[PDB]
């Protein structure tokens, strides 16, 4: 009981930093949460169904601009029912944002790994380079054992 | 297997929640005269 009452302080202090991840862990269900002052407003995230082709774009650079670049890879959600083509970008934990509003000052010597399903797609200097399966990346465990 | 992606629409103030306050801990009265 004492340990739970203490970890409540860590949970309360870390919600501002990442509300969606903590709310998805607590609720045991993928949600999107905002901090509306002293409360948390959650919303369910429906999984992307079939008849949907998610295409991964090659460059993370803004068109024409050179001092500005995107932070996460861009995707093109091609449709099969003829409903057009949505263009967003790759969020975190396989979340597909429907917009490209995550920009950043274009850093030099850029190297990042992004999670695209079961793979870690690698982008070096804002361009696709290679990919590696998730099961191939080495793991570290935060889990303490009790046998 | 097949990777599953998600789509998170922007939340709305409809469902607001809060962290539950800390629970009191039971006093175990183990001990006899």
């Amino acid at each position, epitope marked *: 009981c004492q340990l739970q009452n203490r970890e409540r302080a860590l949970w309360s202090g870390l919600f501002p930093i990442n509300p969606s991840a903590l709310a998805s862990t607590i609720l045991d269900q993928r949600v999107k949460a905002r901090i509306l002052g002293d409360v948390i407003s959650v919303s369910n995230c429906p999984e992307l169904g*079939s*008849d949907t*082709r998610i*295409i*991964l*774009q*090659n*460059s993370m650079r803004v068109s024409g601009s050179t001092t500005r670049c995107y932070s996460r890879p861009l995707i*093109s959600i*091609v449709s*099969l029912n*003829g409903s*057009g*083509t949505v263009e967003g970008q790759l969020g975190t934990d396989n979340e597909l944002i429907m917009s490209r509003d995550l920009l950043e000052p274009c850093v030099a010597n850029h190297k990042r790994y992004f999670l*695209f*399903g079961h*793979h870690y*797609v690698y982008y070096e200097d804002y361009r*696709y380079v290679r*990919e590696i*399966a998730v099961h191939d990346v080495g793991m570290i465990s935060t889990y303490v054992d009790l046998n | *297997t*097949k990777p599953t992606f998600y789509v998170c629409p922007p939340p709305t103030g409809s469902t607001i929640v809060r962290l539950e306050p800390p629970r009191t801990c039971p006093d175990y009265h183990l001990g006899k005269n």
Partner: antibody
Amino acid sequence: QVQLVQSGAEVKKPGSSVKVSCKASGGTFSNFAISWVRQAPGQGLEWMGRIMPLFVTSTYAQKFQGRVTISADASTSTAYMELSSLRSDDTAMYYCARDITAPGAAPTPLNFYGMDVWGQGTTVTVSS
Amino acid sequence: DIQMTQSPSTLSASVGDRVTITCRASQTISTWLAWYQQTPRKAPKLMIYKASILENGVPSRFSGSGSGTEFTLTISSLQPEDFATYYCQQYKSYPWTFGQGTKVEI
């Protein structure tokens, strides 16, 4: 649904071109990476190049790189596969496959969901 | 990779058999194999991509597995619409060289 159609029954003498067309039906043609395959009667299958959206490059295979040329329109929703060689070995059933993609896509096998929809078959003969 | 082998030519079977159409590879295709199906008077059609994933419009009796240079297409509950030629397709580096034979199951 989407439909791709070729020219039809073709008979060409060795020493000319063929110029096989591939008319589409939907899909805006901005999400079409037209590939072309073939197999002679009694052979398995082969691959003859892929033309990706913003159709200017048209990467070809190893064996037909000096022979075939593939192009598209993006306004007519068609794809042409002229050979102009007809070395008497060009007797197969040329197909017009199609993979779903987008312009500016990454050269990754994570963006290949197979040649989902196909054409009809040409049945070209090169002999007199 | 650039050249792939296949299974024997026929693999005769009857309705209700579990048939494997194993085909192999050269340079460790990392789960980048596709399977097709061409009846004698049709065009090939997608069955399996990524060596394990089914296509929309394909019954779930079809399966697939294998990760490197060893991929199998194990069918179960063979309804009488499985008597067709099958092909392995390699997409790891151009050219996409096709594979298997497996003419017909009769």
